[PDB]
Each structure stands twice: as structure tokens, then as C-alpha cells.
Design a protein around this ligand. Structure first.
Ligand SMILES: N=C(N)Nc1ccc(CO)cc1
Length: 248
């Protein structure tokens, strides 16, 4: 996260860290006792499922905490439509090897329904342990960063991405995506944040409006972050989890 601030422990208790061979690579969001949502691009086919872990209940990734829990994955289910970088369907369901116990520091985030509207300009928050500027890692002990960002419609976002664009790049915000950030940049999600939550306030609650997906260099002007809309996958997520692991 660039241009944000450190959260305090427990503030975003659905935020998880996903590591591959022990290195944090992506964020995710806890959505039940055994399932996390992240981005499909975080799980390329050539990676080995047994080399992933998910750390929940963490605030400072480098610090020991008795509240944090680390799990491996039983299943990685990318959306079938995810074809390649920039594609629709950049979302994955991850089933933890074993269920966790919710606590003060580990709690799921509510998912929106298929037609949930989050209006333009709503101030949501993106969180993560990603880079704090392009090519600059968050410094140890790596406290979770948070950043308040207004939602930017995909239409506005597509117009902004066209400004001074490289013609060979599609930079196309799809129908299943929304943006959030600032036309003048400076504040955005970066590499290492992808897969993580865009948490939006609604009626006193928080919903997972988006999953951090892609963008150009974080904090560049006219290049707000692009997020996969959870509402676009509400039906699929509910069908998949209900068939695979119904709540008894
Ligand atoms: N938000 C941007 N402008 N860039 C950006 C870079 C990487 C990821 C995934 O890690 C998300 C967004």
C-alpha cells in the first residue's frame, strides 16, 4: 500500500497474508472458517499447492503473535474464466487445510450479493503488506497498511487509463471490475497487495466489495488500482462453497 498508514492489530481481521515458499506474495480475505478469497493470478498453475501458506490474525508479519494462525491449503479454485493477465475472473477461492477458529483477530468479511451496489465515490479501505511504493518493500516488522480510497467507476477508470497510455497495452477495466483511488495518484495498492480486500462501509457494517487485482505503477497519476468485484462472483462463490462444504 502506498500513501496509506499502519493499521492497528485487529482492525481488519479478515485480511490474510498468502505466502509461497515462505515469502509473502499476495493478500486474501477470510470469508468463513475454512475459505479465503484472493485473486486467481496469485496462483499460477506451475506453482505447487503444498508450498502456499495463509497467515491469519497477523498484524506485523515479521513479529511473533500468539493470535496469528498459519495454515496450508486443501484446495485452490480459480474462476474458470480467468485466462491470462488482465482477464475477467481474477478471483480464487482457497480452502484452508483445516478450519480456523474465529477470534478477536480472525474474522470473516461479509460478501455482497450479486446485485450489491457500491456507489461511485464511496470511501472504502484497501489493506495489505505489499510494497509501499513501486519496487519498495514494506519495512520489517511489516505492520499491515491501510488506505482509504474512493470508488471510481470502471468507465471513468477506463478513461483515466487511456491517458498517455502505451498503445500495446490493453489496460481495460472489465465489467467484473471497479477502480478505487485518486486521479492524481500518490495513494494506491501495490505489488504484494493483490488478492487482498477492498472493504467498503455499508449500513454500519463492512463488505468485501473488491479484490485487489491489477494496475500500473502504484500511485501513478491516472492509474487508480483495479479490483475484481466480489458481487460479480457472489453466485459462483455461494454455489461452490455450498456444494463443497455446506454449513451443517
Ligand atoms: N494499484 C496499482 N496501480 N497497481 C497495482 C499493482 C499490483 C497489484 C497486485 O499486486 C495491484 C495493483
Amino acid at each position: 500500500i502506498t500513501g496509506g498508514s499502519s493499521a492497528v492489530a485487529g482492525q481488519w481481521p479478515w485480511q490474510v497474508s498468502i505466502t509461497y515458499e515462505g515469502v509473502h506474495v499476495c493478500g486474501g480475505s477470510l470469508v468463513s472458517e475454512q475459505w479465503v478469497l484472493s485473486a486467481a493470478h496469485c496462483f499460477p498453475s506451475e506453482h505447487h499447492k503444498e508450498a502456499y501458506e495463509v497467515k491469519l490474525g497477523a498484524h506485523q508479519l515479521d513479529s511473533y503473535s500468539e493470535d496469528a494462525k498459519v495454515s496450508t491449503l486443501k484446495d485452490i479454485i480459480p474462476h474458470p474464466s480467468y485466462l491470462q493477465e488482465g482477464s475477467q475472473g481474477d478471483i480464487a477461492l482457497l480452502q484452508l487445510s483445516r478450519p480456523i477458529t474465529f477470534s478477536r483477530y480472525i474474522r470473516p468479511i461479509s460478501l455482497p450479493a450479486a446485485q450489491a451496489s457500491f456507489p461511485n465515490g464511496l470511501h472504502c479501505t484497501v489493506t495489505g503488506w505489499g510494497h509501499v511504493a513501486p519496487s519498495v518493500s514494506l519495512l520489517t516488522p511489516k505492520p499491515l497498511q491501510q488506505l482509504e480510497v474512493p470508488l471510481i467507476s470502471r468507465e471513468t477508470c477506463n478513461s483515466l487509463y487511456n491517458i498517455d497510455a502505451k498503445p500495446e497495452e490493453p489496460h481495460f477495466v472489465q465489467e467484473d471490475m471497479v477502480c478505487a483511488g485518486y486521479v492524481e495518484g500518490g495513494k494506491d495498492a501495490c505489488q504484494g497487495d493483490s488478492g487482498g480486500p477492498l472493504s467498503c462501509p455499508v449500513e454500519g457494517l463492512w463488505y468485501l466489495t473488491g479484490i485487489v487485482s491489477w494496475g500500473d505503477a502504484c500511485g501513478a497519476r491516472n492509474r487508480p488500482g483495479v479490483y475484481t468485484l466480489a458481487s460479480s462472483y457472489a453466485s459462483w462463490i455461494q454455489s461452490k462453497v455450498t456444494e463443497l462444504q455446506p454449513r451443517v
